[PDB]
Amino acid sequence: GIAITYLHVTDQIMKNRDVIRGENFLGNGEYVTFAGILEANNKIYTAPIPMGLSVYGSAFEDGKWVKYPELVKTEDGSSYEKGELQWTQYPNEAWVAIYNDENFNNPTLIRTDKISYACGRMRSQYYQTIWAADNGDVYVFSPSYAKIMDADVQKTNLPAGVVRIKAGATDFDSYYCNLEELSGGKSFLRCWHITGDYFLLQMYTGEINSRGTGATRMAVFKATGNGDKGELYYVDGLPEPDRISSFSGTPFCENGVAYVGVIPITTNHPAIYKIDPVTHTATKGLTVNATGITAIGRLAKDSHSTYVVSATVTSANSTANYLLATSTLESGSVTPGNNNGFETATGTAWIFYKDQYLYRLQYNGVTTAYELNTNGGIAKRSNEYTITRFTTYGIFGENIISSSAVDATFT
Secondary structure, X not given: OEXXXXXXXXXXXXXXXXXXXXOOOOOOOOOEXXXXXXXXXXXXXXXXXXXXXXXXXXHOOXXXXXXXXXXXXXXXXXXXXXXXXXXXXXXXOEEEXXXXXXXXXXXXXXXXXXXXXXOEEEOOXXXXXXXXXXXOOEEEEEOOHHHHOOOHHHOOOOOOEEEEEOOOOOOOOOOXXXXXXXXXXXXXXXXXXEEOOEEEEEEOOOOXXXXXXOOOEEEEEEOOHHHHOOEEXXXXXXXXXXXXXXXXXXXXXXXXXXXXXXXXXXOOOOXXXXXXXXXXXXXXXXXXXXOEEEEEEEEEEOOEEEEEEEEEEEOXXXXXXXXXXXXXXXXXXXXXXXXXXXXXXXXXXXXEEOOOEEEEEXXXXXXXXXXXXXXXXXXXXXXXXXXXXXXXXXXXXXXXXXXXXXXXXXX
């Protein structure tokens, strides 16, 4: 099944939705994992990523759903159980579920056969690759991660691509762009929206792989460019790919540009680069004297406002996190210890709710949230929450929403 957890930002109350049946979510017996929770056109868009057949799914009605019997596991051994069929049997399609509100009732399920499933993958993580333009059009990106499946029958033959759901529509239109062709042969680990119809793509430099290696380049994608066919320019001004260790997972977008955390290979300090989608150019800005960058955003209260950069500090015997205030992302440096810091425990994920709150999502382990006081200083909200492991998260209305696939057990 699929579990949904709500974190109300005004009332500071957590709620768990009744579990949604994941079995046979798409009509083929397979169960799904939600990837992305996207607010657009007063609706929730998610990509139900197929996971294969459960022990129940494969046995149901004498193998009704089993297309490839040879893939059903014959014993236990991302482990697996006897009777499971790992990964989808239908890799040459993508589904999108559209919900009217945060209750997750009566989805509108639509399918396209032009792309594989819409999510990025790195080991156990799922990356959101469904995003909305400023006009409400929803673009569904697929990197075709299924290319690297061991069994040929589970590999997709579709190149990395993108389709579109126009604002206020309940099905896909005629739009299609081959992103592997547009990039010159490379796929992307994940993607983000910058502004208008511009999108930011973190590209592989080699082949798609489960460990996310070689995703050390960035490209800007204009969806309606070249007569509604797509247009792409690789970003210039970033460090050379062999010098980049990682990018921060969530860019901060403002004034039509995107700010991205870049962590070099090791003195070399992380820094925030501004990416202008019009010029496809990157300029080095704020230096972060820490191990890594885990969040970038703004917090404001009354007359005060400031950029907040969550910075990780990892030593040989400990790891820590600091919320660092700064007036600019384009110049200077921030250092933990210059009074402007607010120490916090490391978090699984970080997300800003507008400029009001910064939520530190942590499972197992407690989840916390932060804001700005009437003096302009970072402060911790009163209520903490214990949430279950999640594979995706997002915001709809006044609710931060987390989602995960769960197993039904009897004890």
